[PDB]
Amino acid sequence: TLRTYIFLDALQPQLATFIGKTARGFLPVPGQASLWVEIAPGIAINRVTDAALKATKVQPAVQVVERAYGLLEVHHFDQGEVLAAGSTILDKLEVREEGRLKPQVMTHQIIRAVEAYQTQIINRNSQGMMILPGESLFILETQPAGYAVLAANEAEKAANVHLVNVTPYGAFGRLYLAGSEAEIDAAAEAAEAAIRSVSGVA
Amino acid sequence: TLRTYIFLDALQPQLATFIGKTARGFLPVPGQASLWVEIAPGIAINRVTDAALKATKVQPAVQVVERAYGLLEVHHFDQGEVLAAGSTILDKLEVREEGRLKPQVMTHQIIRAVEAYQTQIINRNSQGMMILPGESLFILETQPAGYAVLAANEAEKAANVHLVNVTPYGAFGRLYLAGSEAEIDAAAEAAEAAIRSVSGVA
Amino acid sequence: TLRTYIFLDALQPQLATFIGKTARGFLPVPGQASLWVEIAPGIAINRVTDAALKATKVQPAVQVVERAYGLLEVHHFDQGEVLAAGSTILDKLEVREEGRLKPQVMTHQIIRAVEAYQTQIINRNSQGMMILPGESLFILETQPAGYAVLAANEAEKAANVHLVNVTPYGAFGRLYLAGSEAEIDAAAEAAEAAIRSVSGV
Amino acid sequence: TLRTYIFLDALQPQLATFIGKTARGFLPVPGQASLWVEIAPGIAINRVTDAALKATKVQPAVQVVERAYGLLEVHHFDQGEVLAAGSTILDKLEVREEGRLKPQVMTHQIIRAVEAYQTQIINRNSQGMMILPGESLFILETQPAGYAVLAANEAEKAANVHLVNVTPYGAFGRLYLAGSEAEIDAAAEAAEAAIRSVSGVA
Amino acid sequence: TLRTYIFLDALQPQLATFIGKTARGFLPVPGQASLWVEIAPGIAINRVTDAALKATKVQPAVQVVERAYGLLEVHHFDQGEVLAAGSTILDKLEVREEGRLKPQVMTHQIIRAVEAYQTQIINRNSQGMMILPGESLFILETQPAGYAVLAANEAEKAANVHLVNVTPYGAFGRLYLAGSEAEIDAAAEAAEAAIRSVSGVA
Amino acid sequence: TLRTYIFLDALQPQLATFIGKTARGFLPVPGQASLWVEIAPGIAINRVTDAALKATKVQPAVQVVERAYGLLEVHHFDQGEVLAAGSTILDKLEVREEGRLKPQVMTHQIIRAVEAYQTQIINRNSQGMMILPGESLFILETQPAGYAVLAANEAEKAANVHLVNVTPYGAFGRLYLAGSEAEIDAAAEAAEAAIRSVSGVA
Amino acid sequence: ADALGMIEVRGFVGMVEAADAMVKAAKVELIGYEKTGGGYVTAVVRGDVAAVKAATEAGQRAAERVGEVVAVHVIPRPHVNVDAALPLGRTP
Amino acid sequence: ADALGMIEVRGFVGMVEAADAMVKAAKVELIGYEKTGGGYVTAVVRGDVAAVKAATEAGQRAAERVGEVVAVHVIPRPHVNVDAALPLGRTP
Amino acid sequence: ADALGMIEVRGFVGMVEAADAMVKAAKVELIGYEKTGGGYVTAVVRGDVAAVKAATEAGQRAAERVGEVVAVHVIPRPHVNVDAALPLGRTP
Amino acid sequence: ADALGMIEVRGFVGMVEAADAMVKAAKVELIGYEKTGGGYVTAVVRGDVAAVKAATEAGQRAAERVGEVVAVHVIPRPHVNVDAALPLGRTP
Amino acid sequence: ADALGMIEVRGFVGMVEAADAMVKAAKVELIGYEKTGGGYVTAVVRGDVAAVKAATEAGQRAAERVGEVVAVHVIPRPHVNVDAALPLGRTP
């Protein structure tokens, strides 16, 4: 069962930097093309990954089997390789593009002028860049979890923010974005327009 | 959605010691007044914390964005600060005082004279005071997970026990206590009377 | 509420080696007789373990209190000790042998000739023996999570494979095996026939 | 033997945030005054720390014992509190202000436009802000190890850089900074001018 | 070269519990005997351990190789098994009973009425029973590192103290203890009378 | 100062698997070349790694700085790329091929039929293939620390053994191997023939 | 009955430093101070026996630097007539 | 709970000169003076730490020209029992 | 299990004065005495370590000036086998 | 037969300290104590050969700090007439 | 699988003296004796290790006075195949 099929045409450098900081695999570089496939059940993605590695020369970074769900990243410089890998995956799963679950936004909030007591906690349990006190914060949860990297990627494609922590595997995919006020306003507008432009099964 | 709103009027020393042993945030000292708010979805607590930090001078210790739920601890010496922070949290969430879920006890057990083979496993898999072989154990689960600190605080307040473990976040809040037989019995009576003394939504 | 009650008459050396690599407790040696009891809610197993330790002389290795479930392993050389511990556990829970949940196979696949870009991720994200590129992989999900150790044990009892991983606690019990093609095929046949031969609910 | 007695009169926010990201004890907030003491031998700081905690209102973050390099950070809003805590520390040791070792800069290398594969290793083995591919990297060793937080404080205070890492323990103190080329040049000038402007025993 | 050869003729419960909490091996239970062997160089104990495991019914817990400090604890109920394992270890090394280094006490300090802020640092960087604020603190260094477990054993055996931390490895052996003031005094008397009552090469 | 300069011309599969299991960097695949450069002091390799990555197509896995042992691995399919990276590294340091230290064998031990109790301590403190009880054990120390992967590669290349734990970082290089008796004998012969067939400065 | 620990210093500064380092080094209760004239002032702490013993053994070590410590004494279990006659913090 | 500073002078004149120098030296508050009898009097100023640490040093420097200064000491954080029992300006 | 305090006096009179000084020194319980022949007797008190550590020291300081003190020793935690086998006032 | 360990101390205090060391240092059964007059009291532990040999080592090491140790001895297997006629714990 | 002690004596008399010394010196069980021919006979005792290790040393010291002791050795844990195949007293 395909839960998330998202295609990142170009990784922004903080996103690829954050992925390669916490990847259990082959580290991607900025500028590559990426493809995130989250399915349920979680172990069967080890079939799906193999399908890509029997067809194209794409390269996997994040292949994580969680309690319930299984997430696969594949990446390569050539978008033809990555789209052919996605065609191989969708033929192995025997589903289509719109067979994925439609991403739902659970909480989109802008926290303006975050106090220092909170910013000493947000990046106490993060994995990326440090939020600084006084910087506005945008938090975000998407369901299913694999769409949140899109919610990261476009949010850096149309702004200049600092990626704090995006968790792309889970029940609820999570996103933290720090930066100045109008700049994360543009980032939040871009991410909210990017998630609602994804079709699928409700 | 408010799942847990509990107000600890005074932190008993082993509880505050255990919390400050495993906190991501500003460590509390004994005698302070604490407030535990667990809400769903898990990311919106990053909003809620900010509300308290815009209103009062309270100070947070545990702000855990778990896999499903979000838990906030705030604490301060002056109880007026903590009660005003609780009023600010309940007005930001726009719920009442008794809008929390009513806590439910799933398994409350007293295990008398625990063998050594069980004690070594229990206090290998804990971060508190070590249970010794020959001591009576009290195990307790509450749903939602945020009410376990209430049971730990009251069971230490009304007895003389050793806090082995408490887990205030997750699917079910767990409590491991150890001590002599009469003192474990008094702690069990106090905790089972203290959890059922909380009204809310069934 | 009993979810898993499985009884291993003899541990294969790679299985007991992997269990004693990632256990919180008293580590088993190969050849011992083992028993796995997974119940819900996860804290009452701290009662249940105690019952066995008040009856027999078995040693517990894996007593894991999970997010919502609770797993207990006990083991001893004498199968009389382990069966008496199991009788004490099933009388403490006041259930029968068939009160356990019948295990369902959610996914079984034989992945042939796993290339290196997948093997590096599999072995980095495992705790047992390393998978090598070119080796056939067998993956398996059993629900409830405990029965996967049965799905490990017979799959080594009737083959010559390398145990990559087995996760026996959670919402899905997981099994990664790797080896040569015919031996992975025999291991897959043995593991599927071992899981489908367990009665329950 | 006093190896390092340094008084950071203002924690600039990325440094205070990085300290609060790897703080053992009570973590600080920016704007606070800080004080770092490194002594030989190591376990004797366990007494000395308590002396400061009896004297002043200060609160510690990093207290590291390794029997040859003790360490103690303390921090508070009021700079008089932190100076009196340092006076209490120096009186308990019966040493003076000038008994500290004069720090020597032993390596300062500016790596212009670090490529991506190196940045994966740098951020995978660090905690602060991420380094992006193509950004300049300033690395620094100071002897003794306790003076590296002074160079990190002054380099953040002067230039608009990203604090990748600072290791204030061990034999040598490590500093990794990242950013654009002129800002890394100004931060390098600030760190070199800040380390060798410290008086002490050569 | 034999640094430490100590025979713990009975494991008191907090010591056996703490050893079973941080054991890279089989876990001991209270009441059992114990044997600690620390040698120079380190990797040769990989042979020596095996010799003991070929000789006796003993069962190992901690075996640390660092090419200058080997380590081996073996424990079993029958003390004849543990003494014969000691004879096997001393025959494999071709050394004698008196060839061990006589332990010296480097630093013993009693830090009565610890403030809470120091208790946070102490219990976050330890594994044993938690130190409560206001309780005393006995710290100890012994040479070599292996006799600190002997000090912890006799200190638990005499007094009513909480075992906080013990370090049988490294350059020198550390020991932390907590409890009320008179019990910490009695445990300090026990540790000092137990370390310097050991025969060996100065 | 150059300590270890070795050119693994082909990574045998268990070695490449074990390196790609515990690499803070990009991961290698079996069949590629390799290059383990170890220098003294440590932080200078942060320049030297960059000197490889600008020049050639090579791609690193392990890069460790410890101010006494700075170490670097780079790997790529084309062996000319890895030799060119080696020439660029040796030109950056202004040292030569024969400036490396000649490796000496400190301790080689064949421990045959390891009992099940020792296997728990061995595999709990390792990452490679699990040692099984009743299988032999070959342990090895090389001077300097970097030459242990050479013996690991050649011993896997000769005999049909299981790589348990090769440790190339630290004071001296450790090697563990497991398997049946004659295969451990042939692998021990291969490791001893591979270490002392290396030219260098004693 | 609670214990007793008294530090008599010739000088108010030594008594204040003694009574500060006694309450910072134990869980005692500084109940008051006695001014017997001629510069002699006595600080009194009170609590269980080991705590007041550690408190006086810290207060002597602190107040000898900043004054003239005259008397340092601990009474572990005073008779009830002393607490009922002398103003020593436990008058009923 | 501001920091504490005390000057003990054998003599009223030296204490008044010390109390005049301290409140001119920094931001302190002369809360009062304690008369232990026998000629010893102790002026008490109270303020934040780097103010009283300069104030008591200025008072020690000035009051040694006129009288017998017995003790000069600063308490950076007095305990709540010391402020609650002893007459040091901050009785609640 | 309370701590143990034992005072051995070669003589009954020094032992009675030692027992009186111990039970007036702290909060202990004189459980009895042992007559091992040859003129050696032994007073035994029992209480927590803070009380009996001061009690036995006061008993030794008040028992030297009466009789002849042989041995003074404090056991902070006796094992349950000593209290069950030997007559030490906590026989179950 | 169970092995025999005996510590003879001139005085009751050293015997109680020796018994406290023996029953903690091993796993033995303190069966009692023998009084031969003149202050000589003998603690008797009885376990197996491994236990009593390690118990009386700690007994000799802990009873020399408090008094006069007359004798320390371990019999690994006492003859059946010794346990039949002498009261050493296993009297039928 | 208890421990093992073996005394080989060239001669029957020294073996009987060793077997009489070992079962007196500790709690062991003389299970038999093995006549390998040519005068060599091996007395075998069996018990826990601190009994047989203190038994065979006394048996060696006794049997050196009477005969030619060839070998004295203790096996603390004999393997199950050694007990099962050889006549060492514990054949199942």
UniProtKB/Swiss-Prot annotation, chain C:
Artificial BMCs can be made in E.coli by expressing (Hoch_5815, Hoch_5812, Hoch_3341, Hoch_5816, Hoch_4425, Hoch_4426, Hoch_5814) or (BMC-H (Hoch_5815), BMC-P (Hoch_5814), and 3 BMC-T (Hoch_5812, Hoch_5816, Hoch_3341)). Cargo proteins can be targeted to this BMC. Its main location: other. The keyword Acetylation does not apply. Disruption phenotype: Not required for efficient BMC formation; when deleted from an artificial operon (Hoch_5815, Hoch_5812, Hoch_3341, Hoch_5816, Hoch_4425, Hoch_4426, Hoch_5814) being expressed in E.coli, normal BMC shells form. A motif (Pore gating residues) lies at residues 66-67. Keywords: Bacterial microcompartment. It is found in: Bacterial microcompartment. Residues 1-103, 104-201 form the BMC circularly permuted domain. It comes from the Bacteria. These proteins have 2 BMC domains which evolve independently of each other, giving the term pseudohexamer to the trimerized subunit. Although the homotrimer fills the approximate space of a BMC hexamer protein, the BMC-T trimers are more compact. Their universal presence in BMCs indicates their structural importance. The homohexamers form pores at least 5 Angstroms in diameter; in the stacked homohexamer 1 pore is open and the other is closed. In the BMC the inner pore is fully or partially closed while the outer pore is closed. Homotrimerizes to form a pseudohexamer. These stack, with the concave faces together, in purified bacterial microcompartments (BMC). A minor component of the bacterial microcompartment (BMC) shell. Expression of 5 proteins in E.coli (BMC-H (Hoch_5815), BMC-P (Hoch_5814), and 3 BMC-T (Hoch_5812, Hoch_5816, Hoch_3341)) forms 40 nm artificial BMCs with a molecular mass of 6.5 MDa. One of 2 stacked pseudohexamers in the BMC. There are 20 BMC-T pseudohexamers per BMC, composed of mixed BMC-T1, BMC-T2 and BMC-T3. The shell facets are 20-30 Angstroms thick, with 1 of the stacked BMC-T trimers protruding to the exterior. Belongs to the EutL/PduB family. This is Bacterial microcompartment protein trimer-2. It comes from Haliangium ochraceum (strain DSM 14365 / JCM 11303 / SMP-2). The lineage of its organism: Bacteria, Pseudomonadati, Myxococcota, Polyangia, Haliangiales.
UniProtKB/Swiss-Prot annotation, chains G, H, I, J, K:
Residues 3-87 form the BMC domain. One of its GO terms (cellular component) is bacterial microcompartment. It is found in: Bacterial microcompartment. Artificial BMCs can be made in E.coli by expressing (Hoch_5815, Hoch_5812, Hoch_3341, Hoch_5816, Hoch_4425, Hoch_4426, Hoch_5814) or (BMC-H (Hoch_5815), BMC-P (Hoch_5814), and 3 BMC-T (Hoch_5812, Hoch_5816, Hoch_3341)). Cargo proteins can be targeted to this BMC. Artificial BMCs can be made by duplicating this gene with a 16 residue linker between the copies (making an artificial BMC-T). The shell assembles into balls with holes where the pentameric subunit would be, and can be used as a model to study assembly and permeability. Changing residue 77 to A: Forms smaller hexamer patches. Disruption phenotype: Absolutely required for BMC formation; when deleted from an artificial operon (Hoch_5815, Hoch_5812, Hoch_3341, Hoch_5816, Hoch_4425, Hoch_4426, Hoch_5814) being expressed in E.coli, no BMC shells are made. It comes from the Bacteria. Its main location: other. PROSITE patterns: BMC_1 (PS01139), BMC_2 (PS51930). Keywords: Bacterial microcompartment. Gene3D superfamilies: 3.30.70.1710. The only hexameric shell protein in this bacterium, it forms the majority of the bacterial microcompartment (BMC) shell. Expression of 5 proteins in E.coli (BMC-H (Hoch_5815), BMC-P (Hoch_5814), and 3 BMC-T (Hoch_5812, Hoch_5816, Hoch_3341)) forms a 40 nm artificial BMC with a molecular mass of 6.5 MDa. There are 60 BMC-H hexamers per BMC. The shell facets are 20-30 Angstroms thick (a single hexamer layer), with 1 of BMC-T trimers protruding to the exterior. Homohexamer with a small central pore. When purified protein is examined by atomic force microscopy it dynamically makes uniform patches about 35 Angstroms thick with hexamers in the same orientation. In the BMC the concave side faces outward, with the N- and C-terminii exposed to the cytoplasm. Belongs to the bacterial microcompartments protein family. PANTHER family: BACTERIAL MICROCOMPARTMENT SHELL PROTEIN PDUJ, PROPANEDIOL UTILIZATION PROTEIN PDUA. This is Bacterial microcompartment protein homohexamer. It comes from Haliangium ochraceum (strain DSM 14365 / JCM 11303 / SMP-2).
